[PDB]
A paper describes a structure:
The S3T mutation also induces the same conformational changes for the presentation by B57, following the same way of propagation. However, without an arginine at position-97 of B57, two more water molecules, W5 and W6, mediate a hydrogen-bond network to stabilize the E5QW9_S3T buried in the antigen binding groove of B57. In summary, despite differential residues in the binding groove of the two alleles, the structural data indicate that the S3T mutation induces a similar peptide conformation change in B57 and B53. Therefore, differential cross-recognition of QW9_S3T by B53- and B57-restricted QW9-specific CTLs is unlikely to result from structural differences in the peptide presentation but likely from structural differences in the HLAs which select distinct TCRs. We did observe notable local structural differences in peptide-binding between QW9_S3T-B53 and QW9_S3T-B57 due to the sequence differences in the α1 helix of the two molecules. In contrast, for B57, the long sidechain R97B53 is replaced by a short sidechain V97B57, and the short hydroxyl group of S70B57 forms hydrogen bonds to the mainchain and sidechain of N66B57. Conversely, S70B57 likely adds to the stability of variant peptide bound to B57 and may contribute to B57-restricted CTL response upon the viral mutation at a polyclonal level. Employing differential scanning fluorimetry (DSF), we measured the thermal stability of QW9 and QW9_S3T bound to B53 and B57, respectively. Whereas QW9_S3T-B53 manifests less thermostability than QW9-B53, QW9_S3T-B57 is as stable as QW9-B57. Thus far, attempts to generate a QW9-B57 specific CTL clone for similar biochemical and structural TCR analysis have been unsuccessful. However, QW9-B57 and QW9_S3T-B57 dual-tetramer staining of cross-reactive CTLs demonstrated these B57 restricted TCRs have comparable binding affinity with wild-type QW9 and QW9_S3T bound B57, across a range of tetramer concentrations.
One such highly networked epitope associated with control is QW9 (QASQEVKNW, HIV-1 p24gag residues 176-184). QW9 can be presented by the disease-protective HLA-B*5701 (hereafter B57), but also by the typically disease-neutral HLA-B*5301 (hereafter B53). Here we examine the CTL response to QW9, a highly networked epitope presented by the disease-protective HLA-B57 and disease-neutral HLA-B53. To explore the molecular underpinnings of differential cross-recognition of QW9 and QW9_S3T restricted by the two HLAs, we next determined the crystal structures of QW9-B53, QW9_S3T-B53, QW9-B57 and QW9_S3T-B57.
Residue numbers in the entry:
A (entry chain B): 1 to 99
B (entry chain A): 1 to 276
C (entry chain C): 1 to 9
The structure:
Amino acid sequence: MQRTPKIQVYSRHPAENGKSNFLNCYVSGFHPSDIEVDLLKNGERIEKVEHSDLSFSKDWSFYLLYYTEFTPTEKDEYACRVNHVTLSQPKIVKWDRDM
Amino acid sequence: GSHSMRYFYTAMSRPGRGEPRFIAVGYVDDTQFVRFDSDAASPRMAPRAPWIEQEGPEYWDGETRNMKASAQTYRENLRIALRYYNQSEAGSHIIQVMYGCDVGPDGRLLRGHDQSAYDGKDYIALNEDLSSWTAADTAAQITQRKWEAARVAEQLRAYLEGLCVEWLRRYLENGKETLQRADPPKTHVTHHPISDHEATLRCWALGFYPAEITLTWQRDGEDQTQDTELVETRPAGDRTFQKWAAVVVPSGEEQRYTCHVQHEGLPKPLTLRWEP
Amino acid sequence: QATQEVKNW
């Protein structure tokens, strides 16, 4: 009776190094609703990340958008890290600016 | 075109961690406009879209009073559901509800909805007639009998045909600059070699509103449904949505592939290809 | 505008 989250990590606008943007981690398709999401910069948790209000899809699975302002560079690595009751360990999905 | 209004409730028990949390959100189409969270420092129905802010204190006080009462009702319903499924007071459970109305371009009711779930599975639904119920199991049949005896459907019908559509029409007018504006997708195809003899073509749609869209790949004019990777439509955070569709193609055959985009902001469906 | 609850489950 549990459903594991799908995870997409992406930017609000096409990424341009040195130009301010928003980093998004969209978690969806999960049940129950408790979920832990961190956005990471070079492996470290970004503080003060915001998120949308809990809602759900026609199949009753939940979705949430976590987001934070960021300025992408060539070398900085970003990821989001997700934990859920369905996961034995946190799942880390790296940001790929072409996905 | 046509429009919808929907309220979504989630009630989540958490034994040992207080009373169940109740969260409600309201949408017009794909635009959230209100929220309520019983865990907030000061729970109130609160605005989440600019066009709802002009409603007066009577509106906000009435919505807040209703949400506090609804939170209590769903706390009671979570206790009732334990009895209906022979469950203990030790576990955490969830009730979800979605209800609302759809209207056509002339503002007339197209259809109404009131559907509930328990632990992520259908529980009971108001039928399209707005007069009878579909119960998913023998527990929901107990609720159905109670709601038939109390003529609940008649009261929901009166809302769905009346205040639901009247308020939706008001919101559509007050939010006409955004709620009644479709933003078409900005589209392009990218090309990524995988190996010397295969490459990924990815068809992108960005910046569109509302979220409904169709992205299809064809090879020699034949839909590639079973061979296409399609990501879930995702929010950008600026009200818009994003989506892509990808196919793996033999190197040298890229021009045999076309991406097709349908969206209500486009006057005609769009056909695109990789442009090297 | 939301509607009011009518009856418990």
